[PDB]
Amino acid sequence: TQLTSKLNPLKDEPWPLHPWEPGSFRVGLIALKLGMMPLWTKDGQKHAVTLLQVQDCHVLKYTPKEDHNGKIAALTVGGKTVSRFYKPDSRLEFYRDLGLPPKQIHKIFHVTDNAVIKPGTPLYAAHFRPGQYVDVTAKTIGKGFQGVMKRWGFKGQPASHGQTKTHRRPGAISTGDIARVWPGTKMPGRMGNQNRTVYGLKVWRVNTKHNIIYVNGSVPGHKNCLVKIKDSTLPAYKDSCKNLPFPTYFPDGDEEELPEDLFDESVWQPSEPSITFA
Amino acid sequence: EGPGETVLVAEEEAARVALRKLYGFTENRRPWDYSKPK
Amino acid sequence: LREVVKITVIEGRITETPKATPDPPNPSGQCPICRWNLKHKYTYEDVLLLSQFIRPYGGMLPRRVTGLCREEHRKIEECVKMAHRAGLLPNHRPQLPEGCLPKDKPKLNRYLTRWAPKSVKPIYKKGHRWNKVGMAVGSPLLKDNVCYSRRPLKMMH
Amino acid sequence: FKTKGVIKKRCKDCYKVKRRGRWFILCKTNPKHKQRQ
Amino acid sequence: SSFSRAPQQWATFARMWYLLDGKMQPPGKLAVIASNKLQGLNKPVYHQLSDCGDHVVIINTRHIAFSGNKWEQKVYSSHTGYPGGFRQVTAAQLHRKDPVAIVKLAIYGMLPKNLHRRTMMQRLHLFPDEDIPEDILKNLVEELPQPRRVPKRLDEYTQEEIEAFPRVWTPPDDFRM
Amino acid sequence: VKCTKARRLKKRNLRTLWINRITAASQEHGLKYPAFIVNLIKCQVELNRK
Amino acid sequence: KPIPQPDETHEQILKAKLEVRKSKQLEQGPMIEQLSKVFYTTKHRWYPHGQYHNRRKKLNPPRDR
RNA sequence: UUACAAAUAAGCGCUCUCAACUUAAUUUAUGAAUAAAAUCUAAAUAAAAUAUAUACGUACACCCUCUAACCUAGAGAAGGUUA
Numbered sequence: 001t002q003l004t005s006k007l008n009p010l011k012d013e014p015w016p017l018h019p020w021e022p023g024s025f026r027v028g029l030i031a032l033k034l035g036m037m038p039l040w041t042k043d044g045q046k047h048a049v050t051l052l053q054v055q056d057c058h059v060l061k062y063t064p065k066e067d068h069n070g071k072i073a074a075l076t077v078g079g080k081t082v083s084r085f086y087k088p089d090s091r092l093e094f095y096r097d098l099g100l101p102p103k104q105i106h107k108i109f110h111v112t113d114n115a116v117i118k119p120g121t122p123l124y125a126a127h128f129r130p131g132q133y134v135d136v137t138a139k140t141i142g143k144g145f146q147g148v149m150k151r152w153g154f155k156g157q158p159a160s161h162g163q164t165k166t167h168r169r170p171g172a173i174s175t176g177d178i179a180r181v182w183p184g185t186k187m188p189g190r191m192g193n194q195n196r197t198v199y200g201l202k203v204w205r206v207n208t209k210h211n212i213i214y215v216n217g218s219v220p221g222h223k224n225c226l227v228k229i230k231d232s233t234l235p236a237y238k239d240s241c242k243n244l245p246f247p248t249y250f251p252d253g254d255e256e257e258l259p260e261d262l263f264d265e266s267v268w269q270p271s272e273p274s275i276t277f278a
Numbered sequence: 279e280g281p282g283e284t285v286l287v288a289e290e291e292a293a294r295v296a297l298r299k300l301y302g303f304t305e306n307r308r309p310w311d312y313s314k315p316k
Numbered sequence: 317l318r319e320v321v322k323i324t325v326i327e328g329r330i331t332e333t334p335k336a337t338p339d340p341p342n343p344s345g346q347c348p349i350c351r352w353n354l355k356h357k358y359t360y361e362d363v364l365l366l367s368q369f370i371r372p373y374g375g376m377l378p379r380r381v382t383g384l385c386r387e388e389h390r391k392i393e394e395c396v397k398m399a400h401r402a403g404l405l406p407n408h409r410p411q412l413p414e415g416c417l418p419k420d421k422p423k424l425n426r427y428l429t430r431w432a433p434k435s436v437k438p439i440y441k442k443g444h445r446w447n448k449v450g451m452a453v454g455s456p457l458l459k460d461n462v463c464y465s466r467r468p469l470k471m472m473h
Numbered sequence: 474f475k476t477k478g479v480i481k482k483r484c485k486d487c488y489k490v491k492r493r494g495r496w497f498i499l500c501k502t503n504p505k506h507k508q509r510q
Numbered sequence: 511s512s513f514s515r516a517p518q519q520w521a522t523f524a525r526m527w528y529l530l531d532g533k534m535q536p537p538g539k540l541a542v543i544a545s546n547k548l549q550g551l552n553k554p555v556y557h558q559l560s561d562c563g564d565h566v567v568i569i570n571t572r573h574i575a576f577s578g579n580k581w582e583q584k585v586y587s588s589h590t591g592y593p594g595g596f597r598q599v600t601a602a603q604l605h606r607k608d609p610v611a612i613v614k615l616a617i618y619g620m621l622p623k624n625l626h627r628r629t630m631m632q633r634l635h636l637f638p639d640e641d642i643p644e645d646i647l648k649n650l651v652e653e654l655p656q657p658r659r660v661p662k663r664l665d666e667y668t669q670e671e672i673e674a675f676p677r678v679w680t681p682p683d684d685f686r687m
Numbered sequence: 688v689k690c691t692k693a694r695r696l697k698k699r700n701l702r703t704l705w706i707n708r709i710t711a712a713s714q715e716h717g718l719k720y721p722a723f724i725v726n727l728i729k730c731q732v733e734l735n736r737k
Numbered sequence: 738k739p740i741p742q743p744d745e746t747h748e749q750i751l752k753a754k755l756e757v758r759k760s761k762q763l764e765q766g767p768m769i770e771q772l773s774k775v776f777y778t779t780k781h782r783w784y785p786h787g788q789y790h791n792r793r794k795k796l797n798p799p800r801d802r
Numbered sequence: 803u804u805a806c807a808a809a810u811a812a813g814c815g816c817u818c819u820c821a822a823c824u825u826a827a828u829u830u831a832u833g834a835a836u837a838a839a840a841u842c843u844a845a846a847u848a849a850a851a852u853a854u855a856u857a858c859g860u861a862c863a864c865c866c867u868c869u870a871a872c873c874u875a876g877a878g879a880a881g882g883u884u885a
């Protein structure tokens with residue numbers, strides 16, 4: 001019932017929809033990493049692509065420019081509804097006021113005042129379109145406490161010829177005269193489980209029915225790990241948001257009925273004739 | 279005149295100073311003459 | 317003052333020039349500065365004195381025309397540079413050739429500047445207390461100026 | 474722009490300049506005579 | 511004085527707010543004045559153990575001036591604590607990036623090198639320009655004379671004052687000027 | 688030993704305390720410390736720094 | 738200046754400055770930081786001390802007037 | 803591809819990698835001192851021109867229910883999940 005109540009953003013006192021101008025930055029989605037699968041282009045090359053599913057992605061809170069402490073405003077975008085029985089009372093109270101089921105993860109997106117979206121607005125995979133380069137960031141797989149060789153790729157010491165109890169150990173820590181170890185030295189420690197970002201990942205296809213985006217290459221995190229998809233910040237992709245929906249796509253608006261699967265021009269769709277390199 | 283942490287305390291204390299004045303209990307009063315032989 | 321008016325016919329016309337104040341305090345002063353008993357009593361901040369020797373765009377006038385003795389032709393020239401760098405002559409800015417705008421960077425307030433800001437390198441190794449390197453303040457040419465302090469002015473800070 | 478302890482004019486056309494805190498002799502006729510301190 | 515003991519103790523050791531204007535003022539002279547008030551050296555009841563410092567508010571820190579070529583010759587150094595983390599930045603660059611740092615550093619340098627310096631530094635309030643918050647304005651109790659007399663610009667001088675200064679020399683009528 | 692070497696250091700610090708407070712006191716009225724002390728003596732009035 | 742009557746004990750002023758709005762009693766790190774702002778001091782001043790230093794303190798220090 | 807002749811972990815497999823407010827050797831332009839048909843200027847001024855770096859932008863931001871059990875989280879503790 002709560003999810004259905006918010007199914008119609010545009011018919012629920014939406015905020016003004018200002019037009020796009022140069023320098024605008026949109027909001028981004030939080031998706032679940034289903035896995036990977038192969039993909040082919042009309043040139044015949046195979047591109048490894050990963051599947052990201054948007055699940056109950058609803059904007060939660062809207063801070064203003066000044067209070068946010070940044071130049072830009074900031075929106076919070078939660079996803080992946082979870083149970084209510086094992087959450088602190090404070091979190092449940094905040095979600096009850098918002099009128100939405102609790103979400104697994106919160107993240108902050110820097111959004112210009114023109115592109116602001118009212119809190120509680122549902123977000124879908126139609127926010128993106130094939131072609132747009134996108135950036136994904138998530139916690140890396142945690143590998144636990146590891147040695148200096150595996151963590152930083154230290155060469156190590158030979159196994160034979162007399163090396164006695166020294167095979168994977170670090171070498172000389174630092175210089176002798178300084179009588180100390182420089183801060184930040186590479187030493188054995190826990191690896192992984194650190195927030196990292198991948199930049200310039202093209203969007204190959206968008207599945208509207210299941211809200212699945214096909215993102216080129218590898219994305220950080222384990223399978224079923226939540227990520228933070230966002231419009232790419234690289235200089236070449238500075239003004240790729242103009243063509244796409246400026247605030248977002250509202251299916252409830254029903255401006256246009258999109259197909260289930262959206263492809264890029266180079267992508268070779270299945271069921272097409274076999275590729276011939278004429 | 280009176281000093282205070284707040285205006286009300288300063289106002290209340292300022293009254294204390296005046297009452298001494300009228301009664302001449304200002305600390306700078308002529309010291310009691312304990313040394314009179316008589 | 318002879319100035320050229322263009323019309324092509326261009327004509328230079330002599331116009332009346334302001335006359336110098338008569339009765340200098342010191343009669344027969346060989347150099348104009350000494351005539352007025354200002355030999356060793358002027359500094360960079362004396363805009364009124366310095367302005368009397370400067371071209372409309374901030375350039376120095378020739379010694380001959382000004383009449384100052386070389387000793388006071390260099391000191392006056394040195395003080396003028398300090399005044400310009402300190403923004404004490406806002407109405408004598410350089411002539412912009414083709415309406416070019418200023419650099420638009422904010423101007424750092426400076427005074428008693430011996431050298432051009434562009435030509436001074438930073439002192440990365442300050443030096444220790446005994447060997448400490450000094451930063452120039454003022455100019456040596458003003459050594460003889462009257463001092464109203466207990467001890468001589470410290471040129472190097 | 475050879476950096477030398479002493480700057481000496483190599484031709485009559487040579488002239489002296491004080492650029493960016495150092496002394497320069499630049500010769501219009503011959504760029505070879507250009508020097509720095 | 512005939513004041514009660516507790517009000518008398520409160521009055522004597524109360525703390526004051528002083529406003530200093532840094533326009534065309536060298537930071538050092540500001541530092542000399544500011545540091546003295548912060549420690550409480552201006553009070554005849556000053557004691558190193560009494561914590562009698564007072565608040566000082568300095569404005570227009572962006573408009574400070576330096577003698578000579580100190581803008582391009584004075585260098586501030588910092589180390590991040592990692593190899594290659596040594597940065598030497600000239601005063602002009604630091605002032606451009608952070609207008610308030612240069613004034614803050616001078617006061618920090620002059621203050622005594624002990625734990626109380628950090629407590630004193632809290633009392634210092636620096637604003638890049640004349641803008642002040644509402645609460646601070648109410649707090650202010652007095653202002654202090656600027657240490658350096660600001661020389662007047664030629665445009666500032668009145669026409670009559672220009673006349674008062676005698677004309678040292680007059681160019682001949684046959685001069686382009 | 689420190690107690691013995693500090694009996695002749697409270698007589699020099701307590702004086703430096705006085706000079707700090709006299710310098711503060713005169714400055715309120717516009718006089719530097721050297722001017723205040725020297726002139727008072729030159730008037731033949733002898734008052735110590737305590 | 739005329740006394741402004743329209744708006745008071747110092748205890749009330751402290752409560753207004755140290756308003757408890759979030760989390761009821763704040764944790765020491767947050768609470769001490771809030772106190773440090775009000776009095777323009779550092780956090781280190783407000784942190785406690787152990788039982789060695791506490792017992793060194795005099796019970797009845799001398800009083801002069 | 804090689805193992806565990808376990809659902810995993812590796813590389814020999816695969817994908818992604820970016821901006822410069824502030825410069826130096828140097829080069830221009832206007833222009834006086836220096837009576838020019840001069841002069842890049844430790845004269846007043848306008849620009850261009852290495853490496854650096856942090857003006858700028860990413861990342862984090864959420865404040866605590868935890869008998870318990872599970873976990874791509876983990877030495878312990880912490881952390882995540884529980885219609």
Ligand code: FES
Binds near residue numbers: 346347384
């Ligand atoms: S000022 Fe008298 S000789 Fe020049």
Ligand SMILES: [Mg+2]
Binds near residue numbers: 155156157158159
């Ligand atoms: Mg090996």
Ligand SMILES: [Mg+2]
Binds near residue numbers: 159163164166
């Ligand atoms: Mg072995």
Ligand SMILES: [Zn+2]
Binds near residue numbers: 487499501502506
């Ligand atoms: Zn030559």
